[PDB]
Write an enzyme that holds these catalytic residues in place. Sequence first.
Site, short mmCIF file in Angstrom:
data_model
loop_
_atom_site.label_atom_id
_atom_site.label_comp_id
_atom_site.label_asym_id
_atom_site.label_seq_id
_atom_site.Cartn_x
_atom_site.Cartn_y
_atom_site.Cartn_z
N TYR A 152 0.84 -1.20 0.00
CA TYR A 152 0.00 0.00 0.00
C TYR A 152 0.88 1.26 0.00
O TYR A 152 1.42 1.64 1.03
CB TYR A 152 -0.89 -0.03 1.25
CG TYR A 152 -2.20 0.71 1.11
CD1 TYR A 152 -2.38 1.69 0.14
CD2 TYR A 152 -3.26 0.45 1.99
CE1 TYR A 152 -3.59 2.38 0.04
CE2 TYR A 152 -4.45 1.12 1.90
CZ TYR A 152 -4.62 2.08 0.93
OH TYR A 152 -5.82 2.75 0.86
N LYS A 194 -0.80 -1.07 -4.54
CA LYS A 194 -1.81 -0.03 -4.55
C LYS A 194 -1.18 1.33 -4.20
O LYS A 194 -0.39 1.44 -3.28
CB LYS A 194 -2.92 -0.37 -3.54
CG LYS A 194 -4.12 0.61 -3.55
CD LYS A 194 -5.08 0.29 -2.39
CE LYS A 194 -6.20 1.32 -2.27
NZ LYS A 194 -7.20 0.95 -1.21
N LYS A 196 -2.14 5.26 -3.05
CA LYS A 196 -3.11 6.20 -2.52
C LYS A 196 -2.91 7.50 -3.29
O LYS A 196 -1.84 8.11 -3.20
CB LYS A 196 -2.85 6.35 -1.01
CG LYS A 196 -3.60 7.47 -0.27
CD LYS A 196 -5.11 7.20 -0.10
CE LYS A 196 -5.42 5.76 0.15
NZ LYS A 196 -6.87 5.42 -0.05
N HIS A 323 -10.46 -3.84 2.28
CA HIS A 323 -10.04 -2.50 2.64
C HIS A 323 -9.39 -2.52 4.01
O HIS A 323 -9.70 -3.37 4.84
CB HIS A 323 -11.28 -1.58 2.67
CG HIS A 323 -11.06 -0.26 3.34
ND1 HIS A 323 -11.33 -0.04 4.68
CD2 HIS A 323 -10.66 0.94 2.85
CE1 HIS A 323 -11.07 1.22 4.98
NE2 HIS A 323 -10.66 1.83 3.89
N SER A 324 -8.48 -1.58 4.24
CA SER A 324 -7.73 -1.51 5.49
C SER A 324 -7.71 -0.07 5.98
O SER A 324 -7.74 0.88 5.17
CB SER A 324 -6.28 -2.00 5.24
OG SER A 324 -5.38 -1.57 6.25
MG MG Z 1 -10.22 3.12 -1.06
#
Ligand code: MG
Lengths: 427, 427
Positions: A152, A194, A196, A323-324
């Site tokens: 992430y 992923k 952000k 989701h986290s």
């Molecule tokens: Mg999201």
Amino acid sequence: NLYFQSMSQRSIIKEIVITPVAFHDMPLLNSVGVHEPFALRSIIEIITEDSYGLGESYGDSAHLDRLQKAADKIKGLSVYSTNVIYQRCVESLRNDTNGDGMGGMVVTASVADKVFSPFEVACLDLQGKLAGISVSDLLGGRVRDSVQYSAYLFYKWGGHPGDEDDEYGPALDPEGVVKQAKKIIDEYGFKAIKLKGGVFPPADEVAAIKALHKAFPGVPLRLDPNAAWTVETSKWVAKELEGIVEYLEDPAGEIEGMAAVAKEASMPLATNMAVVAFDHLPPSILQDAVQVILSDHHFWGGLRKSQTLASICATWGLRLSMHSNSHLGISLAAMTHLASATPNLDYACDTHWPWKRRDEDVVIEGALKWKDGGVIVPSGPGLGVELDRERLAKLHQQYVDCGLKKRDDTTYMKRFKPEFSEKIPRW
Amino acid sequence: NLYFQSMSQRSIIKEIVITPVAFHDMPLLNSVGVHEPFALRSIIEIITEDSYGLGESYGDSAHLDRLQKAADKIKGLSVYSTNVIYQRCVESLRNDTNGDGMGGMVVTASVADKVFSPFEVACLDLQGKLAGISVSDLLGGRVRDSVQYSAYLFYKWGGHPGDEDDEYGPALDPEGVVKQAKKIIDEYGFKAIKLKGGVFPPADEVAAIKALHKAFPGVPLRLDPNAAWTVETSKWVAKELEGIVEYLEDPAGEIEGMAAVAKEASMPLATNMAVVAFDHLPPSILQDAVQVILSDHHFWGGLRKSQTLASICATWGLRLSMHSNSHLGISLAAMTHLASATPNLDYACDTHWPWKRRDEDVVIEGALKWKDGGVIVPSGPGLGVELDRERLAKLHQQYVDCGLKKRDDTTYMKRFKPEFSEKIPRW
Ligand SMILES: [Mg+2]
Ligand SMILES: [Mg+2]
């Protein structure tokens, strides 16, 4: 006979302890500001005659008050009585008009499910311990022996203003994001990535995704700007990233915005914003708004309710991911058990684990092992983790000492960039 | 530790015995013919090291062959491994192109779910016994201490051709149906009434419902002609019975027929024909075809899958009831546990119990008590019933002796009325 009767008493909830904790967080950037130096959580311990079960939830004050109120009504019930426990949670909110606990990026989830979730997790932990079986067996048995997570990535400052840089240092451009991703993948071995977004103009974030695709060929990529884009901007981004990303997560706001984007986007659209409660399923499905739903048992109502969502997804031909939010070992154990026993939860799950200090947690060390980008499903009864009471007290003391009472990325950002705006969409 | 390790071995499936049985049935009439003198079922016993679990399913030969084939693949698995058990069932049908088991009134249910169901029930029975808890606790705990059933009325001949009248004798007009209903309600105390129609012209069945409304004021009424009507005839019937019935069940055929009827009908429409599998939910919901779904764990895939259907119903604002076929005590125990632990399963459940001889069953007597129109939820571990091995052998011997190999209401009717047609709709 005599076994069934002691089991009735051994399963009664005698006491519930709710403990807020704080752990160090890094200055990760996102659409609404920047993470504060501490992340907050609540640790729930359900205590029976001779055993205990654990859950984990949000740490903001409004939420803790809600948990405590529900907890007062739940005492005396069997850990098997999840139907009536859920009812008590609903009852307890009867007079609650009285914030997300998630930075204001997930605002429309059912409060009753948010409140229910950690009791439900602690109850399943206890049901496992009582029966001598793993939670993953309670949920239909694992279909995989480990659960894959994603790396992430965030844009971030090099450290919190005034303190020294953390071990990652800054990521403010494609090159920094690649360097972060290498550090993370070298440590964990995740096999999916992923980023952000909603932090820089879409053109720049597209550039970071392309730079990641080049540096990590054949590794699935995702982008999440948390609805920072207009529908037209989202359509442009999806055109640019055709064939390059596994899915595009929450490019635009609302079921309606998502649906209009999905009509033109070639990749599937994922969400943890426009669909975050059972009530959101009918309209999303009617409008074909989203193709992938990120589950999160912390706001969908616990492990069994997450399985229900998973079955709804299978029935309607939607895919399922996870989701986290910044979290500790109790949540990691529950996310893992849930994912191991959910056949159609095939995308890699998000986690913030790399952002947390390696020595901060509330569980006894050693029950949660990484291997090849995944957590090996714990093997003992219940969640397979135990409460480290010295470490709980330590992180509770940090809570007390740091004075933070709710998560507030936006106020914290505005301490340094008072002009900053958290409104979306923005580009 | 040592408890968790013995639990791993104590939960492994060593053997599965599938036993067909037959029990006396009466000449009940319905849209496709008349019940034969024997009803068929399969009894499933899962055997572990030191315990066993029970399920119950259809008795036709094609189904038994399917069960046996699945059973061969399931051996060795833990009773907790319901995910992998379901997979083995699906695998086992890989090469099965190879009848309903329900008279041809429920033809589109998932075969894999039909095959899975009794293993899943037996596994939950075993999970309860192992943990010393009731199946209703496994399913979230009871929210009611007994489950209400309906009085299920049929038009019927007075006895099977050539034999003496059974203790009910004939019901061929409104007066006979009322007399049947009084006998049944005097014995059981049910607080809701259902009539099986599609037997006489709709005008006559409307007359029996009105005669029932007069004889049992304020007792909820239902009518089920199993899609024997055209859309126009169904609209006419619903107009006639406005304010008089709780719901109108399967008046017309198909999702499309139901939807067109629902547009004009003032009562909700119920179904166990147009919606009998998860795959049927999306189109039914899209067309707003049905307002009430009768669950049946025997073809929806077991107790947990039925809960999933229940949650889908709650999410989409549909109501939930329960469908029955002629059955024995294992099924009654499972229907009861399921219904007790399902908050939104509020309509009274259908049962055929009054049609079965009071002395025919396969469970040890005394675990299943009626009171005030409902079955009191069994209180011991598992399903709360035990296998009566002398009675199983007796009913298995009846199976062998009666030579019936599948349910066939239509062929049996045509032995006496060779001109009879089972095609629908008919009026
Ligand atoms: Mg999201
Ligand atoms: Mg019916």
